[PDB]
């Protein structure tokens, strides 16, 4: 949890427009940048929060800004460029908001405002939002290369910003299809050297709980043998969605509603046999954005999640007007919001009818339960790994390359305090111990884990975070490096200019 109030209101700098740079800045290093750290921290977020006099209203409406911190021989540069998407380009051309964004209707056609994440496919990198449009980008220069329409290649209306990437380059993702949820597989770059997106395919299909209302889906789980998909009670209303949007003045945010009665439905598929397994896993209602990690343990799937307790859409609390309020009013606004909680669910894969009425979770080191009912629904109760009052452990990361989809022990996260990001956290998921890094009037980003080249242990490496520090007599922002063992500070690299909020990113080794 946090131990800090924010009465100065410096978090408002997270949502303040910035200019792109025409070339890299030098970042002033204090402490010592590890000499094994060679490569680029690439991150995405909004950078332009109004087009002239017309404002964007939602957190997810600002125009995509691609950020790069470069590391070589203990020295650090910083560079950033807006992504030349149709949304950005046409707004610059016409000097107004042209494309309708998530929570901002344009007045007189789907957004490609790729503000959320960036990921590798073959030898290319792609910025994304959660739509059918992804944007190829150049990771050295930050130049926009092209727009890609996923509809051209596979049958999906969108894809998440959280594809899973296996160690050989294979990419898996999930998307709505207007009625199912499709898993897309993009194969690795082959000897023919043609772009792998042209070899995309739908491998497996999950069913929908409602014919006319699919659930919002933000991420999913992957193990060597299984795909896990959590169907939440946050629904997309397709009657409102597919009507004339310039007629009654709609945006995406206006199409979401909450099913009060369904709770949460969890779904598994067999990955290698490409097959939906018909186990009716059920539990109480929550919003879900990020899976932490999933893995197999004997005949059980361990499903670690960042949850929000309730069925109201948490996105309702992320309008810029609210996030720009003063601290007492921020706290007040979050009182009635869903409560964040880290939870472990355990999904049995061997369902014996003879155990009807009993707990199937026979593993020795969990309190999670799964109860087989007579109607063959399997009711789940979680083990709570972390809980704090309006203190979210969010934007989780692990040592993904070696432990993703596999038994693990450590997760890193960004700590939210009534939605305001004010600390960095580490969680031991076996013992429930936590470590915190926190400074006053300092607003960090998602921590990203980088392994040491000779690591013997899971947490042998660093986490990198971009921190905004609007206290005057401090520099506006800096790149933070913490030791992944205890979250003790290793170095920071200060820059001369503000940096707005960023969501997700990656470290690209060189």
Ligand X SMILES: CC1=C(COc2cccc([C@H](O)CCN)c2)C(C)(C)CCC1
Ligand Y SMILES: CCCCCCCCCCCCCCCC(=O)O
**Which region, judged by CB under 8 A, interacts with a copy of itself, from 83-91, 197-205, 303-311, 438-446?**
303-311
**Which region, judged by CB under 6 A, interacts with ligand X, from 26-34, 126-134, 140-148, 414-422?**
126-134
How many of the chain's residues bind a copy of itself (CB under 8 A)?
A: 41
Write the DSSP assignment of 66-91 as a string of letters: EEEEEEETTEEEEEEEE---HHHHHH
Q: Is 79 annotated as a binding residue?
A: no
Q: Is 298 annotated as a binding residue?
A: no
Residue 371 binds a copy of itself (CB under 8 A): yes
Least distance CB 364 / a copy of itself (angstroms): 6
- Confirm if 253 and 314 have CB atoms less than 8 A apart: no
What token pair was written down for 197?
Answer: 């997106």
Q: What is the spatial distance between Cα 416 and Cα 366, in angstroms, rounded to a whole number?
A: 27
| Closer Cβ to a copy of itself, 204 or 371, answer by number | 371
Q: Phi then psi for 310, rounded to 5 degrees?
A: 140, 175
Residue 336 binds a copy of itself (CB under 8 A): yes
Least distance CB 457 / a copy of itself (angstroms): 25
Least distance CB 346 / a copy of itself (angstroms): 11
| Closer Cβ to ligand X, 236 or 268, answer by number | 236
Among 37, 204, 236, 398, binds ligand X (CB under 6 A): 236
Alpha helices in 217-365 (DSSP H): 238-241, 320-323, 327-334
Residue 102 binds ligand X (CB under 6 A): yes
| Closer Cβ to ligand Y, 322 or 377, answer by number | 322
Least distance CB 72 / ligand X (angstroms): 32
| Closer Cβ to ligand X, 252 or 345, answer by number | 252
Instruction: Map residue 283 onto helix, strand or coil.
Output: strand
Q: What is the spatial distance between Cα 55 and Cα 372, in angstroms, rounded to a whole number?
A: 51
Give the CA count within 13 Å in the CB-facing half-sphere of 432: 13
Q: What is the spatial distance between Cα 479 and Cα 80, in angstroms, rounded to a whole number?
A: 14
**Which region, judged by CB under 6 A, interacts with ligand X, from 155-163, 277-285, 440-448, 455-463?**
155-163
Residue 23, beta-bridge partner list: none
Q: How many other C-beta atoms are found inside a 10 Å radius of the C-beta of residue 288? A: 23
Among 40, 63, 173, 176, binds ligand X (CB under 6 A): 176
Binding mask 262-291 for a copy of itself (x = CB under 8 A): ---------------------xxx------
Least distance CB 4 / a copy of itself (angstroms): 15
Q: What is the spatial distance between Cα 69 and Cα 382, in angstroms, rounded to a whole number?
A: 38
CA proximity to 208, closest of 239, 172, 178, 241: 178
Parallel, antiparallel, or unpaired for β 75-82 and 164-165?
Answer: unpaired
Among 2, 85, 111, 173, binds ligand X (CB under 6 A): 111
Least distance CB 398 / ligand Y (angstroms): 16
Instruction: Map residue 265 onto helix, strand or coil.
Output: strand
Q: What is the spatial distance between Cα 52 and Cα 33, in angstroms, rounded to a whole number?
A: 40
Q: Which of residues 33-92 bind ligand X (CB under 6 A)?
A: 60
| Closer Cβ to a copy of itself, 381 or 439, answer by number | 381
Q: What is the spatial distance between Cα 146 and Cα 120, in angstroms, rounded to a whole number?
A: 15
Residue 383 binds ligand X (CB under 6 A): no
Q: What is the spatial distance between Cα 186 and Cα 195, in angstroms, rounded to a whole number?
A: 10
| Closer Cβ to ligand Y, 268 or 416, answer by number | 416
Reported residue count of the chain is 510
Instruction: Map residue 257 onto helix, strand or coil.
Output: strand
Give the CA count within 13 Å in the CB-facing half-sphere of 437: 27
Least distance CB 215 / a copy of itself (angstroms): 17
CA proximity to 365, closest of 411, 433, 431: 431
- How buried is 3 (Cβ within 10 angstroms: 0-12 exposed, 13-18 middle, 19+ buried)? exposed
Q: Phi then psi for 128, rounded to 5 degrees?
A: -145, 165
- Confirm if 99 and 113 have CB atoms less than 8 A apart: yes
Binding partner at 318 among ligand Y, ligand X, a copy of itself, none, C-beta below 5 to 8 Å by kind: ligand Y
Binding partner at 196 among ligand X, ligand Y, a copy of itself, none, C-beta below 5 to 8 Å by kind: none
Instruction: Map residue 44 onto helix, strand or coil.
Output: strand
Residue 157 binds ligand X (CB under 6 A): yes
How does DSSP classify residue 252? S
**Which region, judged by CB under 8 A, interacts with a copy of itself, from 148-156, 168-176, 357-365, 469-477?**
357-365
Alpha helices in 178-250 (DSSP H): 238-241
Residue with tokens 């092209």: 146
Q: Is 291 annotated as a binding residue?
A: no
| Closer Cβ to ligand X, 111 or 135, answer by number | 111
| Closer Cβ to ligand Y, 404 or 415, answer by number | 415
Among 105, 202, 238, 384, binds a copy of itself (CB under 8 A): 384
Q: Is 218 annotated as a binding residue?
A: yes
Binding partner at 129 among ligand X, ligand Y, a copy of itself, none, C-beta below 5 to 8 Å by kind: ligand X
Residue 158 binds ligand X (CB under 6 A): yes
Binding site residues for Fe cation, as ranges? 162, 218, 290, 504
Binding site residues, as ranges? 162, 218, 290, 504
Binding region for a copy of itself (CB under 8 A): 258, 260-261, 283-285, 309-312, 335-341, 355, 357-362, 364-369, 371, 373-375, 379, 381, 383-384, 387-389
Binding region for ligand X (CB under 6 A): 60, 102, 110-111, 116, 129-131, 157-158, 161, 176, 236, 252
């Amino acid at each position: 949890s946090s131990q800090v109030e924010h009465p100065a209101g410096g978090y408002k700098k997270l949502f303040e427009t910035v200019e792109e740079l025409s070339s890299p800045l030098t970042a002033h290093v204090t402490g010592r940048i590890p000499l094994w750290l060679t490569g680029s921290l690439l991150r995405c977020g909004p950078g332009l929060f109004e087009v002239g006099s017309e404002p964007f209203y939602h957190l997810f409406d600002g125009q995509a800004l691609l950020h790069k911190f470069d590391f070589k021989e203990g020295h650090v540069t910083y560079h950033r460029r807006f992504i030349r998407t149709d949304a950005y380009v046409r707004a610059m051309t016409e000097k107004r908001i042209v494309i309708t964004e998530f929570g901002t209707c344009a007045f007189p056609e789907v957004t490609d405002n790729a503000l959320v994440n960036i990921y590798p496919v073959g030898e290319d990198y792609y910025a994304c939002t959660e739509t059918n449009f992804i944007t190829k980008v150049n990771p050295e220069t930050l130049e926009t290369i092209k727009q890609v329409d996923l509809c051209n290649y596979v049958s999906v209306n969108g894809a998440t910003a959280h594809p899973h990437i296996e160690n050989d380059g294979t990419v898996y993702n999930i998307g709505n299809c207007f009625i199912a949820y499709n898993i897309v597989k993009i194969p690795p770059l082959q000897a023919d050297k043609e772009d792998p997106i042209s070899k995309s395919e739908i491998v497996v299909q999950f069913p929908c709980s409602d014919r006319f209302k699919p659930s919002y889906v933000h991420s999913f789980g992957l193990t060597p043998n299984y795909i896990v998909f959590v169907e939440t009670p946050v629904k997309i209303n397709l009657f409102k969605f597919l009507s004339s949007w310039s007629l009654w003045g709609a945006n995406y945010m206006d199409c979401f509603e909450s099913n009060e009665t369904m709770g949460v439905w969890l779904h598994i598929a067999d990955k290698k046999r490409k097959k939906y397994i018909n186990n009716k896993y059920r539990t109480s209602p929550f919003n879900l954005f990020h899976h932490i990690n999933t893995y197999e343990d004997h005949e059980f799937l361990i499903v670690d999640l960042c949850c929000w307790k309730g069925f109201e859409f948490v996105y309702n609390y992320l309008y810029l007007a609210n996030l720009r309020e003063n601290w007492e009013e921020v706290k007040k606004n979050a009182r009635k919001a869903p409560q964040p909680e880290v939870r472990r669910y355990v999904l049995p894969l061997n369902i014996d009818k003879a155990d009807t009425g009993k707990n199937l979770v026979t593993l020795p080191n969990t309190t999670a339960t799964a109860i087989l009912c007579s109607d063959e629904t399997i009711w789940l109760e979680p083990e709570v790994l972390f809980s704090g009052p309006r203190q979210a452990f969010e934007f989780p990361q692990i040592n993904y390359q070696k432990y993703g989809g596999k038994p693990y022990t450590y997760a890193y996260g960004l700590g939210l305090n009534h939605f305001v990001p004010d600390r960095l956290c580490k969680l031991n998921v076996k013992t429930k111990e936590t470590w915190v890094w926190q400074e006053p009037d300092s607003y960090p980003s998602e921590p990203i884990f980088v392994s040491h080249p000779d690591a013997l242990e899971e947490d042998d490496g660093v986490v990198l975070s971009v921190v905004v520090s609007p206290g005057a007599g401090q520099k506006p922002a800096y790149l933070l490096i913490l030791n992944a063992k205890d979250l003790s500070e290793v170095a920071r690299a200060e820059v001369e200019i503000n940096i707005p909020v960023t969501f997700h990113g990656l470290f690209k080794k060189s």
